[PDB]
Amino acid sequence: MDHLPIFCQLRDRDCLIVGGGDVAERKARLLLEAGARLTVNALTFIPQFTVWANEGMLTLVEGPFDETLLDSCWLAIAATDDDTVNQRVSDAAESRRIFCNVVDAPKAASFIMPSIIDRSPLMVAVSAGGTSPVLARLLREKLESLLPQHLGQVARYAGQLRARVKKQFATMGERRRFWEKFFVNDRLAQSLANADEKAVNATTERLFSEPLDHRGEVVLVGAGPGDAGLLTLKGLQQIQQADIVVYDRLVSDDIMNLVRRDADRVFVGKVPQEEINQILLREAQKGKRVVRLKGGDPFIFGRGGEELETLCHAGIPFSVVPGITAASGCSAYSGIPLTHRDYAQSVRLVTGHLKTGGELDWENLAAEKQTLVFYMGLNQAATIQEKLIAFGMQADMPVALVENGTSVKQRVVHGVLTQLGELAQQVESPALIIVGRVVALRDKLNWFSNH
Amino acid sequence: MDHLPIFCQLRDRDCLIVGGGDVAERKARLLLEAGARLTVNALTFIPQFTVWANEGMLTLVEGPFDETLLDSCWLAIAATDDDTVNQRVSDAAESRRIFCNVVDAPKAASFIMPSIIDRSPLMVAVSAGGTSPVLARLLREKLESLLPQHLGQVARYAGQLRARVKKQFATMGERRRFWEKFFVNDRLAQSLANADEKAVNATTERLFSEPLDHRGEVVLVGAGPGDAGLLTLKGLQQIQQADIVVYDRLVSDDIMNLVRRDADRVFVGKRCVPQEEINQILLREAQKGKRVVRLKGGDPFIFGRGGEELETLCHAGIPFSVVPGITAASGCSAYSGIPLTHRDYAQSVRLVTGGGELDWENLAAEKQTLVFYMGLNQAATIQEKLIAFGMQADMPVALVENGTSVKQRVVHGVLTQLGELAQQVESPALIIVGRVVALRDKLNWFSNH
Ligand SMILES: C[C@@]1(CC(=O)O)C2=NC(=C\c3[nH]c(c(CCC(=O)O)c3CC(=O)O)Cc3[nH]c(c(CC(=O)O)c3CCC(=O)O)/C=C3\N/C(=C\2)[C@@H](CCC(=O)O)[C@]3(C)CC(=O)O)/[C@H]1CCC(=O)O
Ligand SMILES: NC(=O)c1ccc[n+]([C@@H]2O[C@H](COP(=O)([O-])OP(=O)(O)OC[C@H]3O[C@@H](n4cnc5c(N)ncnc54)[C@H](O)[C@@H]3O)[C@@H](O)[C@H]2O)c1
Ligand SMILES: Nc1ncnc2c1ncn2[C@@H]1O[C@H](CSCC[C@H](N)C(=O)O)[C@@H](O)[C@H]1O
Ligand SMILES: Nc1ncnc2c1ncn2[C@@H]1O[C@H](CSCC[C@H](N)C(=O)O)[C@@H](O)[C@H]1O
Numbered sequence: 001m002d003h004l005p006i007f008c009q010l011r012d013r014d015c016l017i018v019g020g021g022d023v024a025e026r027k028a029r030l031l032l033e034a035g036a037r038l039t040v041n042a043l044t045f046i047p048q049f050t051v052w053a054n055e056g057m058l059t060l061v062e063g064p065f066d067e068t069l070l071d072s073c074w075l076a077i078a079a080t081d082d083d084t085v086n087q088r089v090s091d092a093a094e095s096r097r098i099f100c101n102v103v104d105a106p107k108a109a110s111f112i113m114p115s116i117i118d119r120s121p122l123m124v125a126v127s128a129g130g131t132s133p134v135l136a137r138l139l140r141e142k143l144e145s146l147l148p149q150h151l152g153q154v155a156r157y158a159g160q161l162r163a164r165v166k167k168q169f170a171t172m173g174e175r176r177r178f179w180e181k182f183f184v185n186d187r188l189a190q191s192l193a194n195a196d197e198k199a200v201n202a203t204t205e206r207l208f209s210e211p212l213d214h215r216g217e218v219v220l221v222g223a224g225p226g227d228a229g230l231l232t233l234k235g236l237q238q239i240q241q242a243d244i245v246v247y248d249r250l251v252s253d254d255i256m257n258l259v260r261r262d263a264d265r266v267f268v269g270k271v272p273q274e275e276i277n278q279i280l281l282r283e284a285q286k287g288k289r290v291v292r293l294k295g296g297d298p299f300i301f302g303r304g305g306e307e308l309e310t311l312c313h314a315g316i317p318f319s320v321v322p323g324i325t326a327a328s329g330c331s332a333y334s335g336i337p338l339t340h341r342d343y344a345q346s347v348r349l350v351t352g353h354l355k356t357g358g359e360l361d362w363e364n365l366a367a368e369k370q371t372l373v374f375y376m377g378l379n380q381a382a383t384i385q386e387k388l389i390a391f392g393m394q395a396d397m398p399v400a401l402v403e404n405g406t407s408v409k410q411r412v413v414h415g416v417l418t419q420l421g422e423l424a425q426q427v428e429s430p431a432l433i434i435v436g437r438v439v440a441l442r443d444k445l446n447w448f449s450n451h
Numbered sequence: 452m453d454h455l456p457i458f459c460q461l462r463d464r465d466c467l468i469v470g471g472g473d474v475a476e477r478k479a480r481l482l483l484e485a486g487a488r489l490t491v492n493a494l495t496f497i498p499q500f501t502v503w504a505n506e507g508m509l510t511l512v513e514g515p516f517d518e519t520l521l522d523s524c525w526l527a528i529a530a531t532d533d534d535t536v537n538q539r540v541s542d543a544a545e546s547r548r549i550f551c552n553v554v555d556a557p558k559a560a561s562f563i564m565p566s567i568i569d570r571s572p573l574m575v576a577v578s579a580g581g582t583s584p585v586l587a588r589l590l591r592e593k594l595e596s597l598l599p600q601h602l603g604q605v606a607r608y609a610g611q612l613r614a615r616v617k618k619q620f621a622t623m624g625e626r627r628r629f630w631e632k633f634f635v636n637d638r639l640a641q642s643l644a645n646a647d648e649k650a651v652n653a654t655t656e657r658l659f660s661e662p663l664d665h666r667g668e669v670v671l672v673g674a675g676p677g678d679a680g681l682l683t684l685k686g687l688q689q690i691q692q693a694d695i696v697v698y699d700r701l702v703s704d705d706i707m708n709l710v711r712r713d714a715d716r717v718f719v720g721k722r723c724v725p726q727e728e729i730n731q732i733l734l735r736e737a738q739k740g741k742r743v744v745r746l747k748g749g750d751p752f753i754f755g756r757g758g759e760e761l762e763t764l765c766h767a768g769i770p771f772s773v774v775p776g777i778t779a780a781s782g783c784s785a786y787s788g789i790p791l792t793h794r795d796y797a798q799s800v801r802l803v804t805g806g807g808e809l810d811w812e813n814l815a816a817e818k819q820t821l822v823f824y825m826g827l828n829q830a831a832t833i834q835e836k837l838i839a840f841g842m843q844a845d846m847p848v849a850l851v852e853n854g855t856s857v858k859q860r861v862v863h864g865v866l867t868q869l870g871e872l873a874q875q876v877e878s879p880a881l882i883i884v885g886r887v888v889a890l891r892d893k894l895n896w897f898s899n900h
């Protein structure tokens with residue numbers, strides 16, 4: 001990331017502002033409200049500084065920059081109109097390791113000031129890093145509409161209850177169930193805003209009085225095929241709120257960046273399958289919220305059935321969030337719809353990785369008016385070619401292979417059936433094989449990239 | 452206000468973490484993402500730390516906390532399970548005026564780590580000062596859903612391409628409407644993200660050429676089968692920047708509630724709008740220079756005629772894109788406890804529609820999960836002809852009606868009972884044929900209605 005956002009306690013801590021005009025003023029107001037012990041060192045001062053100095057709210061130092069003023073300081077702000085003076089202030093601060101903002105110069109400061117949406121004690125800060133000040137302000141206002149004014153009264157009450165919530169709940173997993181109920185009780189929010197105390201207490205005592213469900217849970221979540229925009233709303237919720245995320249390798253890194261930062265991640269795979277099952281079951285028995293995060297959809301060649309059947313009579317609550325399967329993701333992003341008027345009456349989602357002694361039913365697969373989609377079929381493209389031709393599929397039937405579909409790394413090779421073996425040599429997994437006349441639609445429908 | 456948020460530039464600045472467990476490891480990773488010159492001092496380290504040390508990415512000091520490690524430090528984090536150590540650390544940090552966090556003790560610290568939505572260089576931070584971390588996390592989740600993944604790319608390209616400064620826009624009012632066009636153009640954004648810079652300046656100079664009021668594009672968004680939580684993030688983002696939403700009735704009311712409050716709505720469904728009318732409504736509304744979202748149940752390219760709808764816009768020079776959706780097969784499969792595949796049960800899932808006939812001999816072959824879209828009418832012919840063409844009569848069947856919705860109904864039995872099990876359900880309904888259906892009584896986690 002460009003920056004690390006932090007929230008500083010500035011109460012009773014020395015801060016220095018060099019500069020005395022309109023920019024200096026605005027930053028000083030900020031620092032005063034955070035409780036900084038503030039000195040302002042400037043050649044000249046606009047009247048607001050006189051106001052503040054006369055009522056004992058800051059110290060004014062009238063004259064050129066005095067770097068010894070930095071000596072006791074946690075933060076410094078260079079707000080003069082003189083680039084030279086500002087750079088001297090910046091240098092002096094770096095030597096002392098004091099975080100420094102240079103108002104005219106986002107790239108040269110050691111911190112920048114964010115735009116602040118204030119719902120104290122709840123605060124939202126947004127910044128483009130100085131690159132895009134207009135985007136920040138349009139975000140700033142969109143955030144404003146989204147955050148109810150009274151959210152502060154809810155967050156304020158939460159802090160007052162924290163001691164009581166720590167005493168009455170011994171676990172920290174039971175404390176989460178209480179807060180999750182607390183923060184979405186609309187009547188409680190309302191009664192706080194109306195300062196209706198008897199209503200606040202009535203709802204509050206009921207909340208405390210509620211037997212919490214101690215059982216854990218397992219949720220199979222489909223990550224989709226890679227593009228993180230293709231995660232579902234509910235999938236996002238589960239991974240934002242999970243205690244532990246068990247995940248395989250076809251889950252994308254961008255999707256992993258959406259996991260609760262505070263949650264335990266457990267990788268499986270490139271681990272046997274019955275291994276995975278018990279990892280979940282004992283972990284859900286242990287009372288924690290477990291997400292099995294799976295590539296694409298969990299019930300299309302994900303073995304999600306296997307992972308769940310372990311839990312049915314083991315009394316473990318479970319649930320399933322479907323995901324965008326590879327055929328759907330690769331259909332959309334290659335410009336190759338899986339159906340179209342009648343090019344196809346069927347879509348066949350077919351595995352290539354078959355049993356110890358399993359053979360696909362080629363005679364059936366070669367039938368006309370369908371879109372074939374092979375999962376896990378890279379290493380048998382030549383066999384797929386040879387069999388489909390032998391059971392009637394025309395030689396010039398168009399095919400496509402989508403490698404890393406929906407990713408910024410997505411590659412699409414295509415051609416006709418007698419090239420399928422050759423084409424497959426030009427991709428690595430994960431790749432999907434699409435066979436059918438809809439592959440020709442690519443050139444009119446392909447919207448996402450030429451790779 | 453009780454804490455001042457600032458955005459620290461940490462690239463190659465010395466920071467210290469004290470502790471070497473899971474907690475310290477999470478903080479180390481965040482500080483690494485920010486490019487800190489990271490030292491980690493702990494009595495023992497979990498493996499992740501020594502991996503990080505072997506790839507040159509940080510420095511480890513094995514042993515008790517030594518406060519001279521703070522000597523050239525900009526930021527300090529106390530992440531041990533030992534309050535005595537954490538106090539020693541934060542105290543050592545305060546006398547040096549090094550901003551310090553005690554992970555576990557928000558007011559021991561001199562700073563708090565907020566929740567972070569990272570769209571670098573664009574960033575959002577959420578904190579309540581230690582009073583409401585769950586609330587902070589709830590707000591992170593929603594901001595993650597609302598902020599596109601590659602807004603950052605656009606952020607970068609923006610500050611740079613203002614070389615066309617006032618160029619053609621002298622009014623702050625004119626400019627901020629160009630920036631409005633600019634930051635929500637998600638095609639520019641993915642073309643940036645994909646590095647396709649022929650598609651960049653394509654989309655770029657259209658933005659600088661076309662009239663400033665004009666925003667003409669079409670997005671096919673799949674709404675999934677009805678549960679509003681099955682919209683994708685990008686689905687949501689798109690239906691929130693729409694000028695005009697064209698929706699079709701297989702779009703649930705819950706999904707429509709998420710639609711932009713100020714978007715226009717055109718209901719193209721039944722009460723029977725033929726396809727061509729739809730195909731030019733989209734065309735027309737996009738010709739007017741409006742950001743058009745066409746909402747469709749499930750996934751647009753699976754029996755949705757999505758391709759037909761894009762054939763219109765293709766040669767009209769109107770940009771389009773597609774956001775796939777959860778198709779009814781997946782949604783019904785997940786919410787009914789019937790996986791489309793399981794072990795050796797099925798080598799292939801068949802999504803099939805209810806001029807021409809269906810190849811019953813092929814539908815009848817073994818080791819398939821058959822999924823019948825729009826087949827409630829034909830449910831009796833289906834039953835008849837599947838048995839006639841050799842499918843074993845005991846084959847489990849299930850019909851899922853309004854799958855994923857708060858009124859979904861699952862009625863199941865055996866191929867003999869297919870036609871009559873259909874009278875119990877109304878459109879929209881899926882017919883599932885195959886041995887996977889039997890797992891329902893072991894995997895039914897939704898509530899049947
Ligand atoms: C942002 C993030 C750091 C990061 O970015 O990595 C950080 N912790 C994360 C989330 C989170 N951590 C925990 C919970 C469950 C809490 C619950 O149930 O109440 C959650 C919420 C959740 O996600 O469920 C365990 C925990 N944490 C704290 C306590 C209480 C205490 O210590 O007093 C307890 C439980 C002890 C108990 O159960 O008793 C303290 C804090 N948690 C805050 C945020 C800070 C002030 C919050 C504010 O003032 O509003 C602060 C002081 C940490 C700091 O400043 O370092 C990261 C968000 C990642 C994301 O958003 O994805
Ligand atoms: N690119 C843009 O379009 C853009 C973006 C942001 C801001 N701006 C403008 O730039 C303006 C800057 O002007 P200002 O508001 O600061 O008014 P100002 O002229 O009063 O600020 C100068 C201040 O710097 C101090 N100063 C100068 N030399 C000094 C020295 N050697 N030691 C100590 N202090 C010294 C003085 O106290 C003086 O008050 C802002 O008002 C803002 O509107 C323009
Ligand atoms: N992004 C992607 N692009 C192309 N193929 C992918 C893919 N992600 C997964 N696949 C395919 O999925 C196979 C794994 S089987 C798991 C598939 C997943 N459950 C789904 O519903 O899509 C891989 O062999 C590969 O063929
Ligand atoms: N919520 C739902 N529950 C069960 N079946 C549904 C459904 N929504 C759509 N369908 C099925 O889809 C048919 C309409 S055709 C449109 C399908 C859509 N493109 C998709 O991906 O799902 C209906 O006849 C019904 O069989």
Ligand SMILES: [Cl-]
Pocket residue numbers: 127128129130131132133134136
């Ligand atoms: Cl900015």
Ligand SMILES: [Cl-]
Pocket residue numbers: 139142
């Ligand atoms: Cl936005």
Ligand SMILES: [Cl-]
Pocket residue numbers: 299300301302303304792793794
């Ligand atoms: Cl499977």
Ligand SMILES: [Cl-]
Pocket residue numbers: 338339340341342343344345
């Ligand atoms: Cl078709």
Ligand SMILES: [Cl-]
Pocket residue numbers: 339340341753754755756757
């Ligand atoms: Cl179709």
Ligand SMILES: [Cl-]
Pocket residue numbers: 796817818819886
């Ligand atoms: Cl079978």
Ligand SMILES: [Cl-]
Pocket residue numbers: 805824825826827828878
């Ligand atoms: Cl029907």
